[PDB]
Design a protein around this ligand. Sequence first.
Ligand code: HEM
Ligand code: HEM
Ligand code: HEM
Ligand code: HEM
Lengths: 225, 225
Amino acid sequence: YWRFLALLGSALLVGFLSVIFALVWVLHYREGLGWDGSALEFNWHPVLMVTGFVFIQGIAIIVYRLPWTWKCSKLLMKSIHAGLNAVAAILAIISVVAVFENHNVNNIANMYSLHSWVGLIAVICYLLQLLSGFSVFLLPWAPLSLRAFLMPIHVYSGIVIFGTVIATALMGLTEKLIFSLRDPAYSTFPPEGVFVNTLGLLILVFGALIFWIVTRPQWKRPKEP
Amino acid sequence: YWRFLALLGSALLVGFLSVIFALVWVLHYREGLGWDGSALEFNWHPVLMVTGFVFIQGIAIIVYRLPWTWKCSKLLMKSIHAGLNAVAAILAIISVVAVFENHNVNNIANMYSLHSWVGLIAVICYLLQLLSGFSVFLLPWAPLSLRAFLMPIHVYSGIVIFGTVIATALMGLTEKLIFSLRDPAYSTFPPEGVFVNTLGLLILVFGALIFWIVTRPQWKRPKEP
Ligand code: HEM
Ligand code: HEM
Ligand code: HEM
Ligand code: HEM
């Protein structure tokens, strides 16, 4: 228990510092936020991706392992899981609408990067996991046999989508640092560069923590009757 | 069994195509290979990283789950594991010596990027997992109690290092594409750009496959007497 608490506490801390770091970066180092800057719009992209796709999704993935929930309703904890993942799907979609509207308004090319390829698949895989998870594991009519062998795919896919989001995030930080830190150049170790590398590491440590919590068999929600 | 075979076969295929794709890219799209180009030297970096740190390490991680090995010697399969990981440690170190020698000869800055921060920690964590794994699990004097609770950390850390290498690789592809595809620009969808994005996806699919194999409890090497 109290090593779980300490680990949950650590992941919340690093997860909140990531969101904090993403906000300071766009509000104090970049131009800020707005729904047409248009770089004030683009900046919603990293902010909302860190906040929903990395942080809120990180918490949805461990929601069933909070021991205060074990003798809670399984339908209820399915609802918090479903709902916390839906919030991150909304924010991530909004996040992608930000780049497309900044790009199209500014006549920039779309979908040429490995970041955007990996990312757009992450997003599509995410919605499919959300739609499939809703009709099979929340919704009532599905055959309990189809439950039995979709479940290993669903647990694996969620960890693998969550890992791929983190790898897309560090790619997006990389692109945006390189595009932006032209003078002083990124390679000159400017403060924005040290700061956002540290945001990169924080997003890293958060994933490692979420992956630790979620693979402790002693912390699985105890199977139902 | 035969779904394991098919999955092992798939991961070997995508793992070999990654190495192939990394070679074609530097030999047919870039300047080629050499031990002083000096871009002929830098190119050893992605080639050796994909080959040893992603591919050979991907195979070392699943070496205990080959069913042809289950009634093999555990000391022997510890030796293939140890040895396959040592080969990737050598290649990765060599790979890092390539960038430092290209940078220092060409007066480029070192260790300013998130790619290099994450990567250098991956490398250091890798060697520590290798040194710790050698003295605790190959070597004979360690208390069987210290075996018992280092093992969960060692399995977790190997998956987490392997994931972080993949995320570093896609960052390195991102940087190198952006630095290089200046004219025709990356954003103009040039063939090198489509090709190396596809190398990025292949490295992705390889990790997802290695992670699938390595988390099937039905495929764990059956515990010893
Ligand atoms: C993209 C969205 C989703 C992701 C990434 C996701 C991811 C995951 C992950 C990683 C686990 C294993 C966590 C654990 O061991 O506690 C899990 C468990 C589960 N998910 Fe989801 N999930 C998503 C959407 C849904 C939805 C909509 C439902 C519908 C009810 C659902 C139902 C479940 C159930 C029943 C479990 C097993 C709970 C248990 O351990 O007893 N998921 N999910
Ligand atoms: C990890 C979650 C993320 C996902 C799923 C994601 C997904 C995407 C997608 C689909 C695009 C293409 C949009 C377009 O073509 O207009 C894109 C573009 C971009 N993203 Fe992200 N992104 C994520 C995180 C980040 C972060 C944290 C940053 C850092 C600022 C970032 C920086 C960028 C930049 C600069 C572009 C435009 C250049 C390009 O097309 O590659 N992204 N992202
Ligand atoms: C950086 C290098 C290393 C990495 C990334 C690594 C990674 C891993 C991973 C991911 C597993 C779990 C695989 C599975 O379930 O089959 C594992 C298992 C193991 N590793 Fe390592 N390892 C490394 C070095 C070593 C070394 C040097 C030894 C020394 C003998 C060692 C001994 C073991 C043992 C005994 C197991 C458990 C085998 C079993 O399932 O019965 N590893 N390693
Ligand atoms: C995934 C395994 C990888 C690791 C552990 C890794 C690690 C590193 C390290 C430590 C550096 C800094 C070297 C220096 O400062 O001179 C670096 C630089 C670099 N890497 Fe990688 N790398 C990997 C994969 C890749 C790949 C696949 C590419 C694609 C070509 C790449 C491209 C670069 C580039 C262009 C640099 C120099 C610019 C910079 O300092 O960021 N790397 N890498």
